Ligand binder design. Structure first.
Ligand SMILES: COC(=O)c1c(OC)cc2cc3c(c(O)c2c1C)C(=O)[C@]1(OC)C(=O)C=C(OC)[C@@H](O)[C@]1(O)C3=O
Ligand SMILES: [Mg+2]
Ligand SMILES: [Mg+2]
Ligand SMILES: [Mg+2]
Ligand SMILES: [Mg+2]
Ligand SMILES: [Mg+2]
Ligand SMILES: [Mg+2]
Ligand SMILES: [Mg+2]
Ligand SMILES: [Mg+2]
Ligand SMILES: [Mg+2]
Ligand SMILES: [Mg+2]
Ligand SMILES: [Mg+2]
Ligand SMILES: [Mg+2]
Ligand SMILES: [Mg+2]
Ligand SMILES: [Mg+2]
Ligand SMILES: [Mg+2]
Ligand SMILES: [Mg+2]
Ligand SMILES: [Mg+2]
Ligand SMILES: [Mg+2]
Ligand SMILES: [Mg+2]
Ligand SMILES: [Mg+2]
Ligand SMILES: [Mg+2]
Ligand SMILES: [Mg+2]
Ligand SMILES: [Mg+2]
Ligand SMILES: [Mg+2]
Ligand SMILES: [Mg+2]
Ligand SMILES: [Mg+2]
Ligand SMILES: [Mg+2]
Ligand SMILES: [Mg+2]
Ligand SMILES: [Mg+2]
Ligand SMILES: [Mg+2]
Ligand SMILES: [Mg+2]
Ligand SMILES: [Mg+2]
Ligand SMILES: [Mg+2]
Ligand SMILES: [Zn+2]
Lengths: 201, 49, 131, 52, 190
RNA sequence: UGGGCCACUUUUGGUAAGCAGAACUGGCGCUGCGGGAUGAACCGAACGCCGGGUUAAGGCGCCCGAUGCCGACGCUCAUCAGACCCCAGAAAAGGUGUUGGUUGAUAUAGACAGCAGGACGGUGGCCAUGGAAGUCGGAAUCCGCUAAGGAGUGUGUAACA
RNA sequence: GACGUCGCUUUUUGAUCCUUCGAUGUCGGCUCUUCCUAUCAUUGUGAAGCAGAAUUCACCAAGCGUUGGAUUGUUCACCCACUAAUAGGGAACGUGAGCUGGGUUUAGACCGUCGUGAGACAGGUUAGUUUUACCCUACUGAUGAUGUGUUGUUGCCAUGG
RNA sequence: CGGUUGGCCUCGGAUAGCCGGUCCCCCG
């Protein structure tokens, strides 16, 4: 598999998705992770916010410009978690970190592609439903990310365009079913071949 | 400045006073009240200021 | 009503001004200024209209070895007066008052600044001229 | 001259309460344990003193 | 310890019409309509009758902490049913010792302004929650009547007003001035 | 060589100490290697130069080899969670947070909690009039003429409240 | 909060002697930055034996502030005065190629006590050389470098304050 | 200087619920 693997970050848990992404990107496999503002973290919003604010407190007090850089965008927060799971002080880890690319929302080389899902990092699979969780977008916005309103409006536009394309696809599928019902008498010879070998229940 | 930091942060911090450039600085001052807007040197005839 | 504007102080703690009323004091030696929170190494200083704690160095013996509140009425240092004019006096002078602003004496020799005459109505009553 | 009915209304909202001896929280008059995680939900309570 | 099944039931009157779009209750009685989303609790809700209209809620392998939510959901739905049949009214009385508390109701019962609370010059303005109407009573002298369909909105508005008129840096065993909720009744009383 | 040091157990002085001093065995010193992230001494195991196989102690989300098992049963939510010999940080005391258990008690002659009727009387005998024809620091304490009622735990009191 | 009892801290002083004796400049002040919180003031609160005013006890909280002098080398102290308050500490008991050199702590000298004496004194007194940065880093400013073919103009904001 | 050895051109999502298709109302 030589193509790019495009994952949708919405509904996924941060560290589990980061671990999967890190092993893939070390094994090769250019990975794009879109919609990093939809990533979930387990534990309630307040204690996740406190963890981030303790991280914000960590600062080189001789030169904070030299010190640890606290990125605010959810894409860069996810990227830094994968960076923490990578061996980034080596050329191999740096090549993997370059092989990874992250985005807030879905930019338009990827809004017209199929996004995959990692069920081993999904919130509905890995958390009990009676447990609190947080949103990376809300957490980022309250620790100082500037761009959650523009991302929301652009995502609304993208969702409208996707609804239009999906209605086109549904009309095409209805036409294809109608065409099968029309010319079934000349594909009956070929249909029974496929039914015999397990295609076409 | 007689002392620049303690022994043991082992570095001069960014927050002690050092010598260097003074002035030629970009500043943004607010709440400056306009008292009058002038009108320039118009010529109707033998002109008027 | 109205609060006093900031004037130039120029009358620090160790200053010896002259007592300007008939109490029998001649000198006032400032030791303090009423209302100074201060700053590291900065000497507390007074201007016209300020209440100070003062001792009298030469004068009557029943005044001499004590601390009195006093009000500075004339300063040799020039201060802007917000109608543009800078004003200064020939001397430095103050009068002994009590805690609520009543003069210990009864008559003031010489001019009294307007910046203290409007603040202290009992001082301005005893004054001869308001310069 | 404040009416006794309104006075007991305001006293129901301001005076008839329990105080936690460990943290000082203002608790409903039938409380047995304090609600605050600060004191560890202790059962060491006293009534709120009265001006009477 | 996980109970196999914990369940209980709410009866529905004839003049109300309720619809369940999943864990979303729409109540449709005579005084309007209400709607509440319960999708933070894992229960199942079901309508039973065709002329008696029972509503069951079921919990299905919960522990104690989630078995509480069964009775909580049913009480919330009963408050919705009461709100659309009879509607909630909170009567709150103004209590003062010296300075009379002057309350003026700005636009269409949606804003309240308290002027002379404890002789202070600051005018406090409380915005009512949407769908809650405040008015001055006519039967008794110094009393607000605030009415609505949602018990949560009406009671939160009353608590808003009550915590607006609060006394600071004084003895709250003396200085008992304020505006306090005197009773929580309904409209039409039947 | 005649400076030793550390560890289990025993042990002396000392509040104690990575303190000082002994016994016994093992180590380190004189010793690399696997693990304990890191570390003279811990745990495994001691070493010529290599290939294959297998292990110990230790592990198996990712860094990082190995659970990417459709692993088993429970417990636990922390607005300072917790997370592995030495070891690198906590106690007395509490919690109507939740889970299990021990023992005792009440209940169709109907529990518990709420809707409530008579729910009280000479005798307050005694006590004490600075306090009882209800509710009081003292010793006290009966019968009520009762479907069941005090010398009250209820109504902040000398009070018939 | 008595009799008792459980702790924390390393801003006290001890105990120890592991590091340093082919040298880590040894008191205090001045200057300057930063941190802590066990909060004096200020913000928001709860309690009172909180009527008001004043005060006391707690909580979130270290953002911000916490002074001018007399005497002493002093750290400490004590007083005068102002103040919202005049809180407490750490950073090699911060800070000597930053200063100063009053103290201590070489050589001169005086006194008291001790010693036959030479001399001693963790007793008093007085006089007594404080050296070097041009290296690396750090920091403060100053050119520049790296891709977009070259070059210019107008701009955005990651991140740091 | 080397990698590589067919492509996927797309609903939003829910998870104590979903997906698809039609007859009667409403949206220029
Ligand atoms: C105790 O405070 C000192 O640390 C200290 C000091 O503090 C400034 C100065 C000096 C000065 C000196 C000496 C010191 O020892 C000394 C000491 C210890 C000497 O020893 C010296 O040679 C250098 C010498 O041998 C002959 C003389 O006296 C016999 C001295 O004068 C001498 O010439 C000198 O200059
Ligand atoms: Mg100074
Ligand atoms: Mg209820
Ligand atoms: Mg008060
Ligand atoms: Mg030897
Ligand atoms: Mg030993
Ligand atoms: Mg040796
Ligand atoms: Mg050997
Ligand atoms: Mg060995
Ligand atoms: Mg090893
Ligand atoms: Mg370890
Ligand atoms: Mg081998
Ligand atoms: Mg490991
Ligand atoms: Mg692996
Ligand atoms: Mg030593
Ligand atoms: Mg030793
Ligand atoms: Mg040495
Ligand atoms: Mg050396
Ligand atoms: Mg040296
Ligand atoms: Mg040095
Ligand atoms: Mg605190
Ligand atoms: Mg600041
Ligand atoms: Mg030092
Ligand atoms: Mg130095
Ligand atoms: Mg020096
Ligand atoms: Mg000297
Ligand atoms: Mg010498
Ligand atoms: Mg000499
Ligand atoms: Mg000498
Ligand atoms: Mg002799
Ligand atoms: Mg000397
Ligand atoms: Mg000399
Ligand atoms: Mg040069
Ligand atoms: Mg910023
Ligand atoms: Zn409490």
């Amino acid at each position: 598999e030589v193509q790019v693997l495009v994952l949708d970050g919405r509904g996924h848990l941060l560290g589990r998705l980061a671990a999967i992404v890190a092993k893939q990107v070390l094994l090769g496999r250019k990975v794009v992770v879109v919609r990093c503002e939809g990533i979930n973290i387990s534990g309630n919003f307040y204690r996740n916010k406190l963890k981030y604010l303790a991280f914000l407190r960590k600062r080189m007090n001789t030169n904070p410009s030299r010190g640890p850089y606290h990125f605010r965008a959810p894409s860069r927060i996810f990227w830094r978690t994968v960076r923490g799971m990578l061996p980034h002080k080596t050329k191999r880890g740096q090549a993997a970190l370059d092989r990874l690319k992250v985005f807030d929302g879905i930019p338009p080389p990827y809004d017209k592609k199929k996004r995959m899902v990692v069920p081993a990092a999904l919130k509905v699979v890995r958390l009990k439903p009676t447990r609190k969780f947080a949103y990376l977008g809300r957490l980022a916005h309250e620790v100082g990310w500037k761009y959650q309103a523009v991302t929301a409006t652009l995502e609304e536009k993208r969702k409208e365009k996707a609804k239009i394309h999906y209605r086109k696809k549904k009309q095409l599928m209805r036409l294809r079913k109608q065409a099968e019902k029309n010319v079934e008498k000349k594909i009956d010879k070929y249909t029974e071949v496929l039914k015999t070998h397990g295609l076409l229940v | 400045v007689a002392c620049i930091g303690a022994w043991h942060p082992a570095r001069v911090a960014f927050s002690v006073a050092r010598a260097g450039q003074k002035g030629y600085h970009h500043r943004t001052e607010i709440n400056k009240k306009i008292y009058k807007i002038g009108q320039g040197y118009l010529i109707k005839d033998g002109k008027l200021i | 009503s109205g609060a006093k504007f900031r004037i130039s102080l120029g009358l620090p703690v160790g200053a010896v001004i002259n007592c300007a009323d008939n109490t029998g004091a001649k000198n006032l030696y400032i030791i303090s200024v009423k209302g100074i929170k201060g700053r590291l190494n900065r000497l507390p200083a007074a201007g016209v209209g300020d209440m100070v704690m003062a001792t009298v160095k030469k004068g009557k013996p029943e005044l001499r070895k004590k601390v009195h509140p006093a009000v500075v009425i004339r300063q040799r240092k020039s201060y802007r007066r917000k109608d543009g004019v800078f004003l200064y006096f020939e001397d430095n002078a103050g009068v002994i008052v009590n805690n609520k602003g009543e003069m210990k004496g009864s008559a003031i020799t010489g001019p009294v600044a307007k910046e203290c005459a409007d603040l202290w109505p009992r001082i301005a009553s005893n004054a001869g001229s308001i310069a | 001259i404040i009416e006794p009915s309104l006075r007991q209304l305001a006293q129901k909202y301001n005076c008839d309460k329990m105080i936690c001896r460990k943290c000082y929280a203002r608790l409903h008059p039938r409380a047995v344990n304090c609600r605050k995680k600060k004191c560890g939900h202790t059962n060491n309570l006293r009534p709120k003193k009265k001006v009477k | 310890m996980k109970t196999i099944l914990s369940n209980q039931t709410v009866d529905i009157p004839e003049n109300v019409d309720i619809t369940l779009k999943g864990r979303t209750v729409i109540v449709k009685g005579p005084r309007g309509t209400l709607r509440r989303d319960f999708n933070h609790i894992n229960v199942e809700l079901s309508l039973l009758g065709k002329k008696k209209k029972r509503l069951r809620v079921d919990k299905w392998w919960g522990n104690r902490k989630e078995l509480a939510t069964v009775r909580t959901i049913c009480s919330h739905v009963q408050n919705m049913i009461k709100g659309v049949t009879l509607g909630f009214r909170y009567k709150m009385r103004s209590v003062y010792a010296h300075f009379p508390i002057n309350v003026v109701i700005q636009e269409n019962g949606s804003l309240v302004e308290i002027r002379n609370f404890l002789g202070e010059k600051y005018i406090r303005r409380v915005r009512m929650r949407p769908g809650v109407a405040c008015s001055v009573s006519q039967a008794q002298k110094d009393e607000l009547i605030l009415e609505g369909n949602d018990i949560e909105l009406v009671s939160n508005s009353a608590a808003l007003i009550q915590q607006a008129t609060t006394v600071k840096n004084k003895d709250i065993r003396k200085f008992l001035d304020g505006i306090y909720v005197s009773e929580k009744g309904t409209v039409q009383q039947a």
